[PDB]
Amino acid sequence: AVSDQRLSEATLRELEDERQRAGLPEKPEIPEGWTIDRKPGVTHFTMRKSHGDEEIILQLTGEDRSNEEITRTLDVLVVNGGKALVFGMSVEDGEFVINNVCFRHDGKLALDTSAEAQFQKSQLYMGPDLADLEDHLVDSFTSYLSARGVNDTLANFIDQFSLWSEQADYEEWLSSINKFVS
Amino acid sequence: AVSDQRLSEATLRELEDERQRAGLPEKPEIPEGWTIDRKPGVTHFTMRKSHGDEEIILQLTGEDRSNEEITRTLDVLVVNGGKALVFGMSVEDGEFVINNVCFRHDGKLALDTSAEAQFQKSQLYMGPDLADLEDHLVDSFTSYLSARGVNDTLANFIDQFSLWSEQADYEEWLSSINKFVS
Amino acid sequence: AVSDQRLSEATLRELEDERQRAGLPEKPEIPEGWTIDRKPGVTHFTMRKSHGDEEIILQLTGEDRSNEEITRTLDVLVVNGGKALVFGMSVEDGEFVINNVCFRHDGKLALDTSAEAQFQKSQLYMGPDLADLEDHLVDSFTSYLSARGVNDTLANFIDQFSLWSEQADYEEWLSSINKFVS
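YS: structure for the whole thing
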């Protein structure tokens, strides 16, 4: 009873204080052509846009490693003709860093995000170590992504949008716990 | 043939020796009100108890990091009205340490332990970094858990019970391999 | 348009250059009695062989840790009478290293490789830390595996086969991306 009252008061106090703190991120305008699939409470959102016959899909996959600077991981899929080119990437200081480049003959499997689909794809070839590739190849991959809008502007939007939604999720977190304990 | 005979003899010898070794953990009495779901050979057991209209669920999730001292991870769910407050915790020297605090609007999903359910929840907001919260809030969370029996006594029971069942699982391990190879 | 042309040219160039590079692994002859389940583009293949009433199954599970020397992880299952002895192992310099030894009463579950099956098995007893076992026991386990063909010869075949298929997967990777971008 009392402990629940304390938690109720504490969450309300934080919600009120938080809203008065400076630094509250402003909501970024979504890049032209991109659609966004983001719901309150869901941190790993997805973005999509068409590129002629291809569809470009951006799926956040996580945040990693101890770090002073926040680095996010995401997959970029380019789907066309039932197949997909899948780029394993991370955003480091407003820029996209390619970590892996995989090719999926089974585009349907590539798009499937179920736990079972993830396991099946984990057994597939993950492409070469980027470090074993010459610049002409690596640069061509980066130019290919840039021609499709996957550039610093988009990487920049991802950080900005993530901060804003994290802030919104945090306040919704406080409010829902307050209601729950009340 | 011979190798199997050797393995058969070796496991029997260990089983006999083990039973004569000192330090065999004694079976802990389960805390009042708590029910326990533990079967031989299953290391990650679950504990449950009611708290009025709420149900409190303890699910061991693992053991981690290289360590001189054994640290276990577990989730503590407080379910009520179709929603759940989920505490990501670990037991460090008889005490509960809160690592994460999440809120799940979809209590049914929160309770679902399938691989698919885990993946879906991995994309949800994981709450704030405990380090960014003031003591008044953090202490209120700890008091809330304590009022429900999630205290040092329970943390202490978890270590004790885990040691005892590990010991039992080890002997059952020796015996089943012996029978298998025979 | 241009970026895609560049990527098309770059992949073709690499494919042509790669084929002229020395060091191309030669295809290993599969050990007697073993069957192999490997498809182009699939890195984690499985090997199987019968041993009287038992079936021995080798399933690659990954590659790990930063390393100058490539170390692979795999599970070795010995199934008989609806039960399985499961060895968690890794290949380090042509030799098998036992990391874990588990026993599965539910052989069907042991054989199930679905994401859901993996999660269920992750909650089971994982056997003792090999470091807490005397040589007589550990050596008996190694002899048991050796009598079934799981020896340095097989470990050696796994590295050799993996290198050859990695090389094949790499060239197929270049070719499929080239066709895709064209």
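YS: worth flagging: The first strand of chain A starts at residue 35 and ends at 37.
IM: good catch. Also The helical segments of chain A are 2-18, 107-111, 115-121, 135-146, 152-181.
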